[PDB]
Amino acid sequence: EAELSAQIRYLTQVATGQPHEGSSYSSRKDCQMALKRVDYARLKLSDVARTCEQMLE
């Protein structure tokens, strides 16, 4: 009983109203964009390597 009551008192202190209008989705979208960029670059690079290999016969 004592521990749970103390927890409830603390939770009142934090007071936890409406949800936190906090989101990390912006940085996530940006970082996914960067990963997609490096993916496109690596893809096209694999392609140009294939081409130069062919020519290099």
């Binding site: 940006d30 964009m33 960029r37 496109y40 670059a41 096209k44 392609d47 140009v48 081409t51 020519m55």
Partner: protein
């Protein structure tokens, strides 16, 4: 290699003139320390050496070209005009060039692309 002699000597004369140009250049920059730089003298000497080399080279190529290896030459007038292996090597070269141009185009596209993105938001 006769026409080779002609062209190489031609280029040696340009090399003569350009070496003289840079020699006077180096002389102009000279400083007469007031310093102890001394690297100037090094470049001057080892530069002057190449000139000496090229002169003997020119004498040699001149001799070999006016050697006149059995040639009954006609005067320039009437020359102004008023083998399969060549074809094969030319064809192979043109093909390799085309492939190189595909490669260059691919790289161009990649560079345009990477530029578009980063410059858009980086």
């Amino acid at each position: 290699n006769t026409a080779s002699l002609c062209r190489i000597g031609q280029e040696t004369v340009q090399d003569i003139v350009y070496r003289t140009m840079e020699i006077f250049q180096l002389l102009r920059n000279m400083q007469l320390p007031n310093g102890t730089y001394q690297d100037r003298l090094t470049k001057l000497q080892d530069n002057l050496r190449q000139l000496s080399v090229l002169f003997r080279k020119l004498r040699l190529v001149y001799d070999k070209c006016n050697e006149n290896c059995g040639g009954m030459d006609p005067i320039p007038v009437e020359q102004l005009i008023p083998r399969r292996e060549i074809a094969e090597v030319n064809k192979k070269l043109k093909q390799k060039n085309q492939q190189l141009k595909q490669i260059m185009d691919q790289l161009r596209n990649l560079i345009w692309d990477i530029n578009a993105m980063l410059a858009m938001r980086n």
